[PDB]
PDB file of C-alpha atoms in Angstrom:
ATOM      1  CA  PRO A   8       0.000   0.000   0.000  1.00 29.87           C
ATOM      2  CA  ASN A   9       1.192   3.488  -0.857  1.00 30.28           C
ATOM      3  CA  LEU A  10       0.198   4.793   2.565  1.00 31.32           C
ATOM      4  CA  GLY A  11       2.341   2.040   4.089  1.00 33.00           C
ATOM      5  CA  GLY A  12       1.486  -1.079   6.021  1.00 32.86           C
ATOM      6  CA  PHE A  13       0.464  -4.552   4.967  1.00 34.61           C
ATOM      7  CA  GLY A  14      -1.460  -5.174   1.774  1.00 36.42           C
ATOM      8  CA  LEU A  15      -3.968  -7.961   2.370  1.00 33.86           C
ATOM      9  CA  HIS A  16      -6.112  -9.956  -0.020  1.00 33.21           C
ATOM     10  CA  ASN A  17      -8.173 -10.975   3.021  1.00 32.97           C
ATOM     11  CA  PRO A  18      -8.026  -8.117   5.519  1.00 33.44           C
ATOM     12  CA  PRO A  19      -9.535  -8.333   8.998  1.00 31.98           C
ATOM     13  CA  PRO A  20     -13.321  -8.328   8.695  1.00 29.37           C
ATOM     14  CA  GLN A  21     -15.342  -5.211   9.328  1.00 30.67           C
ATOM     15  CA  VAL A  22     -17.202  -5.244  12.644  1.00 26.84           C
ATOM     16  CA  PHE A  23     -20.630  -3.628  12.419  1.00 25.96           C
ATOM     17  CA  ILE A  24     -22.723  -2.549  15.386  1.00 21.59           C
ATOM     18  CA  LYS A  25     -26.097  -0.850  15.666  1.00 25.16           C
ATOM     19  CA  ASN A  26     -28.584   0.000  18.359  1.00 26.33           C
ATOM     20  CA  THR A  27     -31.663  -2.096  17.760  1.00 30.31           C
ATOM     21  CA  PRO A  28     -34.590   0.253  17.070  1.00 30.31           C
ATOM     22  CA  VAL A  29     -37.016   0.456  19.975  1.00 28.28           C
ATOM     23  CA  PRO A  30     -40.357   1.691  18.603  1.00 27.83           C
ATOM     24  CA  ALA A  31     -42.376   4.285  20.462  1.00 29.59           C
ATOM     25  CA  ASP A  32     -46.064   4.205  21.315  1.00 31.75           C
ATOM     26  CA  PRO A  33     -48.152   2.895  18.380  1.00 33.98           C
ATOM     27  CA  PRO A  34     -51.545   4.327  17.428  1.00 35.02           C
ATOM     28  CA  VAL A  35     -54.546   2.609  18.973  1.00 34.28           C
ATOM     29  CA  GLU A  36     -56.366   2.542  15.664  1.00 31.91           C
ATOM     30  CA  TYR A  37     -54.301   0.903  12.959  1.00 31.40           C
ATOM     31  CA  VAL A  38     -53.012   3.168  10.206  1.00 31.92           C
ATOM     32  CA  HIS A  39     -51.017   2.256   7.111  1.00 33.95           C
ATOM     33  CA  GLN A  40     -47.873   4.382   7.119  1.00 32.45           C
ATOM     34  CA  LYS A  41     -44.144   4.087   7.475  1.00 33.95           C
ATOM     35  CA  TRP A  42     -43.096   3.896  11.114  1.00 32.83           C
ATOM     36  CA  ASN A  43     -41.021   6.930  12.095  1.00 35.12           C
ATOM     37  CA  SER A  44     -41.522   6.847  15.901  1.00 37.51           C
ATOM     38  CA  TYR A  45     -38.686   5.602  18.093  1.00 37.73           C
ATOM     39  CA  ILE A  46     -37.368   5.814  21.616  1.00 36.18           C
ATOM     40  CA  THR A  47     -33.970   7.487  21.675  1.00 33.96           C
ATOM     41  CA  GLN A  48     -31.322   4.874  22.439  1.00 32.88           C
ATOM     42  CA  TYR A  49     -27.585   4.733  22.719  1.00 30.32           C
ATOM     43  CA  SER A  50     -25.242   2.022  23.878  1.00 31.78           C
ATOM     44  CA  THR A  51     -21.840   1.768  25.487  1.00 28.78           C
ATOM     45  CA  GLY A  52     -19.526  -1.010  26.532  1.00 27.27           C
ATOM     46  CA  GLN A  53     -16.001  -2.317  26.385  1.00 28.79           C
ATOM     47  CA  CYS A  54     -14.111  -3.944  23.545  1.00 31.62           C
ATOM     48  CA  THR A  55     -10.857  -5.879  23.653  1.00 33.35           C
ATOM     49  CA  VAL A  56      -8.571  -6.266  20.647  1.00 34.57           C
ATOM     50  CA  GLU A  57      -5.901  -8.949  20.906  1.00 31.02           C
ATOM     51  CA  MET A  58      -3.342  -9.150  18.109  1.00 27.42           C
ATOM     52  CA  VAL A  59      -0.460 -11.567  17.651  1.00 28.13           C
ATOM     53  CA  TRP A  60       2.588 -10.260  15.809  1.00 27.09           C
ATOM     54  CA  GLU A  61       5.427 -12.289  14.349  1.00 26.46           C
ATOM     55  CA  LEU A  62       8.924 -10.865  14.716  1.00 26.45           C
ATOM     56  CA  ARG A  63      12.281 -11.256  13.014  1.00 23.71           C
ATOM     57  CA  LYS A  64      15.158 -11.003  15.447  1.00 26.30           C
ATOM     58  CA  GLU A  65      18.036  -8.650  14.732  1.00 26.47           C
ATOM     59  CA  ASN A  66      21.126 -10.680  13.841  1.00 24.70           C
ATOM     60  CA  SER A  67      24.195  -8.580  13.158  1.00 28.51           C
ATOM     61  CA  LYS A  68      27.965  -8.755  13.394  1.00 25.53           C
ATOM     62  CA  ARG A  69      28.345  -4.964  13.435  1.00 28.34           C
ATOM     63  CA  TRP A  70      31.071  -3.938  15.874  1.00 26.58           C
ATOM     64  CA  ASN A  71      30.112  -0.342  16.587  1.00 27.08           C
ATOM     65  CA  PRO A  72      26.921   0.825  18.326  1.00 25.53           C
ATOM     66  CA  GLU A  73      23.768   1.409  16.324  1.00 26.47           C
ATOM     67  CA  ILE A  74      21.053   4.032  16.206  1.00 27.74           C
ATOM     68  CA  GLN A  75      18.310   3.590  18.785  1.00 30.87           C
ATOM     69  CA  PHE A  76      15.059   5.398  19.360  1.00 26.86           C
ATOM     70  CA  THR A  77      15.399   7.212  22.675  1.00 25.66           C
ATOM     71  CA  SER A  78      13.754   9.949  24.697  1.00 27.41           C
ATOM     72  CA  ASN A  79      15.627  13.153  23.935  1.00 26.47           C
ATOM     73  CA  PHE A  80      12.706  15.474  24.626  1.00 27.90           C
ATOM     74  CA  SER A  81      14.434  17.081  27.616  1.00 27.06           C
ATOM     75  CA  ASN A  82      12.508  19.310  30.011  1.00 24.96           C
ATOM     76  CA  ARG A  83       8.763  19.510  29.512  1.00 26.86           C
ATOM     77  CA  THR A  84       5.672  20.728  31.320  1.00 30.21           C
ATOM     78  CA  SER A  85       4.159  17.264  30.841  1.00 28.55           C
ATOM     79  CA  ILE A  86       5.585  13.872  29.991  1.00 25.62           C
ATOM     80  CA  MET A  87       5.897  13.236  26.284  1.00 26.71           C
ATOM     81  CA  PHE A  88       3.609  10.432  25.118  1.00 27.02           C
ATOM     82  CA  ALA A  89       1.479  11.001  28.205  1.00 25.27           C
ATOM     83  CA  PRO A  90      -1.458  13.145  29.295  1.00 22.90           C
ATOM     84  CA  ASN A  91      -0.975  16.856  29.842  1.00 23.31           C
ATOM     85  CA  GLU A  92      -2.362  18.979  32.684  1.00 25.43           C
ATOM     86  CA  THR A  93      -5.876  18.914  31.233  1.00 23.81           C
ATOM     87  CA  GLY A  94      -5.730  15.212  30.419  1.00 26.73           C
ATOM     88  CA  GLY A  95      -5.165  15.381  26.684  1.00 30.17           C
ATOM     89  CA  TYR A  96      -2.930  12.638  25.363  1.00 31.16           C
ATOM     90  CA  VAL A  97       0.087  14.060  23.567  1.00 32.64           C
ATOM     91  CA  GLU A  98       2.066  12.282  20.885  1.00 35.18           C
ATOM     92  CA  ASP A  99       3.865  15.027  18.969  1.00 35.47           C
ATOM     93  CA  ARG A 100       6.485  12.874  17.320  1.00 38.36           C
ATOM     94  CA  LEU A 101       6.056  10.390  14.502  1.00 41.38           C
ATOM     95  CA  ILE A 102       8.035   7.218  15.102  1.00 44.09           C
ATOM     96  CA  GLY A 103       9.086   4.951  12.266  1.00 48.62           C
ATOM     97  CA  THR A 104      10.516   1.484  12.540  1.00 48.47           C
ATOM     98  CA  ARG A 105      13.871   1.957  10.817  1.00 46.86           C
ATOM     99  CA  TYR A 106      16.747   2.367  13.280  1.00 49.30           C
ATOM    100  CA  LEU A 107      18.742  -0.839  13.136  1.00 49.35           C
ATOM    101  CA  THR A 108      20.860  -1.165  10.017  1.00 47.36           C
ATOM    102  CA  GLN A 109      21.625  -4.028   7.670  1.00 47.96           C
ATOM    103  CA  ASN A 110      23.810  -4.444   4.617  1.00 48.82           C
ATOM    104  CA  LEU A 111      22.305  -4.490   1.155  1.00 46.73           C
TER     105      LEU A 111
ATOM    106  CA  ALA B   5      49.347 -33.921  22.382  1.00 45.59           C
ATOM    107  CA  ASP B   6      50.140 -32.314  19.043  1.00 50.84           C
ATOM    108  CA  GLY B   7      53.031 -31.840  16.659  1.00 50.62           C
ATOM    109  CA  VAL B   8      54.843 -28.975  15.002  1.00 46.02           C
ATOM    110  CA  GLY B   9      52.550 -28.779  12.005  1.00 44.05           C
ATOM    111  CA  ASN B  10      49.088 -28.828  13.580  1.00 43.52           C
ATOM    112  CA  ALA B  11      47.233 -25.961  15.180  1.00 41.80           C
ATOM    113  CA  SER B  12      46.273 -26.623  18.784  1.00 44.15           C
ATOM    114  CA  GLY B  13      43.281 -24.285  18.726  1.00 44.65           C
ATOM    115  CA  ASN B  14      40.944 -22.117  16.690  1.00 44.91           C
ATOM    116  CA  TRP B  15      39.911 -18.470  16.776  1.00 44.66           C
ATOM    117  CA  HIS B  16      36.713 -17.747  18.723  1.00 47.92           C
ATOM    118  CA  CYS B  17      35.127 -14.309  19.065  1.00 47.39           C
ATOM    119  CA  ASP B  18      31.363 -14.078  19.424  1.00 46.53           C
ATOM    120  CA  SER B  19      28.645 -13.156  21.865  1.00 48.52           C
ATOM    121  CA  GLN B  20      25.669 -15.483  22.363  1.00 49.11           C
ATOM    122  CA  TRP B  21      22.424 -14.290  23.868  1.00 47.02           C
ATOM    123  CA  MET B  22      20.237 -17.079  25.187  1.00 46.42           C
ATOM    124  CA  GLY B  23      17.434 -16.473  27.632  1.00 44.51           C
ATOM    125  CA  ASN B  24      18.680 -14.749  30.760  1.00 46.10           C
ATOM    126  CA  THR B  25      22.311 -15.347  29.892  1.00 43.82           C
ATOM    127  CA  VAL B  26      24.924 -13.950  27.524  1.00 41.24           C
ATOM    128  CA  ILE B  27      28.146 -15.775  26.660  1.00 41.31           C
ATOM    129  CA  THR B  28      31.109 -13.735  25.434  1.00 44.80           C
ATOM    130  CA  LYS B  29      34.078 -15.334  23.676  1.00 46.08           C
ATOM    131  CA  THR B  30      37.199 -13.492  22.618  1.00 43.59           C
ATOM    132  CA  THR B  31      40.590 -14.473  21.252  1.00 43.52           C
ATOM    133  CA  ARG B  32      43.840 -12.520  21.279  1.00 42.39           C
ATOM    134  CA  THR B  33      47.388 -12.954  20.120  1.00 42.63           C
ATOM    135  CA  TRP B  34      49.771 -12.448  23.045  1.00 38.97           C
ATOM    136  CA  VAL B  35      53.521 -11.821  23.262  1.00 42.33           C
ATOM    137  CA  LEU B  36      55.627 -12.870  26.230  1.00 45.02           C
ATOM    138  CA  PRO B  37      59.214 -11.667  26.728  1.00 45.08           C
ATOM    139  CA  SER B  38      61.667 -13.098  29.242  1.00 44.43           C
ATOM    140  CA  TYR B  39      61.440 -10.726  32.170  1.00 45.68           C
ATOM    141  CA  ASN B  40      64.373  -9.925  34.473  1.00 45.17           C
ATOM    142  CA  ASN B  41      66.400 -12.421  32.438  1.00 43.35           C
ATOM    143  CA  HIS B  42      65.219 -15.396  34.508  1.00 39.11           C
ATOM    144  CA  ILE B  43      65.804 -14.015  38.015  1.00 43.23           C
ATOM    145  CA  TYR B  44      63.828 -12.570  40.881  1.00 44.86           C
ATOM    146  CA  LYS B  45      64.748  -9.052  41.933  1.00 47.09           C
ATOM    147  CA  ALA B  46      64.156  -7.487  45.316  1.00 51.16           C
ATOM    148  CA  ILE B  47      62.741  -4.068  44.454  1.00 52.86           C
ATOM    149  CA  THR B  48      62.181  -1.092  46.737  1.00 51.95           C
ATOM    150  CA  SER B  49      61.578   2.626  46.593  1.00 50.33           C
ATOM    151  CA  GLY B  50      65.333   3.012  46.968  1.00 46.87           C
ATOM    152  CA  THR B  51      66.796   5.977  48.806  1.00 45.61           C
ATOM    153  CA  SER B  52      63.413   7.740  48.860  1.00 45.99           C
ATOM    154  CA  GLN B  53      62.820   9.131  52.338  1.00 45.47           C
ATOM    155  CA  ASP B  54      59.150   9.976  51.779  1.00 47.34           C
ATOM    156  CA  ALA B  55      57.152   7.408  53.714  1.00 48.40           C
ATOM    157  CA  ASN B  56      54.150   7.864  51.444  1.00 48.14           C
ATOM    158  CA  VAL B  57      55.858   6.486  48.332  1.00 51.58           C
ATOM    159  CA  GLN B  58      57.924   3.751  49.979  1.00 52.34           C
ATOM    160  CA  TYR B  59      57.476   0.110  49.043  1.00 51.93           C
ATOM    161  CA  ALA B  60      59.296  -3.200  49.042  1.00 53.79           C
ATOM    162  CA  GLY B  61      58.651  -6.213  46.876  1.00 51.75           C
ATOM    163  CA  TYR B  62      59.812  -8.470  44.091  1.00 49.80           C
ATOM    164  CA  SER B  63      59.716  -8.511  40.333  1.00 49.24           C
ATOM    165  CA  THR B  64      59.485 -11.998  38.884  1.00 48.79           C
ATOM    166  CA  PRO B  65      60.536 -13.591  35.597  1.00 50.49           C
ATOM    167  CA  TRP B  66      56.844 -14.486  35.119  1.00 50.82           C
ATOM    168  CA  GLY B  67      54.164 -12.697  33.139  1.00 50.02           C
ATOM    169  CA  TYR B  68      50.411 -12.814  33.540  1.00 48.26           C
ATOM    170  CA  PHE B  69      47.078 -12.369  31.778  1.00 47.77           C
ATOM    171  CA  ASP B  70      44.731  -9.559  32.829  1.00 47.50           C
ATOM    172  CA  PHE B  71      41.285  -9.623  31.169  1.00 45.26           C
ATOM    173  CA  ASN B  72      39.600  -7.700  34.013  1.00 47.64           C
ATOM    174  CA  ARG B  73      38.074  -4.902  31.914  1.00 47.71           C
ATOM    175  CA  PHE B  74      34.648  -5.222  30.275  1.00 46.98           C
ATOM    176  CA  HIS B  75      35.711  -4.065  26.819  1.00 45.56           C
ATOM    177  CA  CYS B  76      37.857  -7.185  26.732  1.00 46.78           C
ATOM    178  CA  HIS B  77      34.695  -9.273  26.607  1.00 46.48           C
ATOM    179  CA  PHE B  78      32.104  -7.015  24.956  1.00 47.45           C
ATOM    180  CA  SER B  79      31.982  -5.297  21.629  1.00 47.08           C
ATOM    181  CA  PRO B  80      30.454  -1.820  21.816  1.00 47.82           C
ATOM    182  CA  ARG B  81      27.399  -3.181  20.009  1.00 48.49           C
ATOM    183  CA  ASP B  82      27.042  -6.023  22.510  1.00 48.74           C
ATOM    184  CA  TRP B  83      27.464  -3.568  25.366  1.00 47.90           C
ATOM    185  CA  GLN B  84      24.590  -1.659  23.773  1.00 44.87           C
ATOM    186  CA  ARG B  85      22.333  -4.715  23.679  1.00 42.74           C
ATOM    187  CA  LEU B  86      23.200  -5.272  27.320  1.00 43.12           C
ATOM    188  CA  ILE B  87      22.515  -1.811  28.689  1.00 43.65           C
ATOM    189  CA  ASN B  88      19.412  -0.986  26.687  1.00 43.33           C
ATOM    190  CA  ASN B  89      17.519  -4.204  27.346  1.00 46.49           C
ATOM    191  CA  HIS B  90      18.468  -5.457  30.811  1.00 43.37           C
ATOM    192  CA  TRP B  91      18.231  -4.410  34.443  1.00 42.16           C
ATOM    193  CA  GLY B  92      21.154  -6.427  35.772  1.00 42.76           C
ATOM    194  CA  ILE B  93      24.244  -8.465  35.031  1.00 38.94           C
ATOM    195  CA  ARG B  94      26.644 -10.596  37.036  1.00 37.52           C
ATOM    196  CA  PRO B  95      29.459 -12.957  36.047  1.00 38.71           C
ATOM    197  CA  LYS B  96      28.757 -16.675  36.264  1.00 39.78           C
ATOM    198  CA  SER B  97      31.558 -18.805  34.819  1.00 38.36           C
ATOM    199  CA  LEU B  98      34.891 -18.446  33.061  1.00 38.12           C
ATOM    200  CA  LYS B  99      36.921 -20.543  30.621  1.00 40.03           C
ATOM    201  CA  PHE B 100      40.458 -19.636  29.533  1.00 36.90           C
ATOM    202  CA  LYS B 101      42.708 -21.223  26.911  1.00 37.85           C
ATOM    203  CA  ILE B 102      46.284 -20.864  25.707  1.00 38.85           C
ATOM    204  CA  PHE B 103      47.115 -22.518  22.403  1.00 40.42           C
ATOM    205  CA  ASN B 104      49.125 -22.304  19.183  1.00 42.90           C
ATOM    206  CA  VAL B 105      52.244 -21.638  21.227  1.00 41.56           C
TER     207      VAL B 105
END
């Protein structure tokens, strides 16, 4: 994929969820019409996502140290990659995967 | 054990990381002279009158091996794998060889 990631012929299936319509009070005398009357509903709950990832171990004979991703943010008014004073979660830095090196 | 024309050992330098243990192997070429020309010498601080620098002892015809620094056993890259990923280290066992004399 041009945006990056894993191209999949069979991607994870889409998970669809709706609130089942709860109809409101029907008319005592039957009428033939489309039913537009509903009780206002919403739902909430918890969802767990569990993914298994396969890894390739770094195997290298390089003598000198390599590049590592580290915290070099220094002094801040809140922790980086944490909530701020008002509780907003702050990730201001994009992090790629390419740090270790390998020969062509 | 072995003749003139056979090597009595092979070169081994690697680091192996298995589980909670790392094994370092390293090989060097060493040179030994004949020290003191085969005698022991009583050595002192000489005529020095300063008590702080005074000493008495012996130099020997013998040499010795000192591997007691970490960079003997760890490449910088291995030292990096150690310090970034682990909370603790201690030595467990030691094997030493002299060969191809």
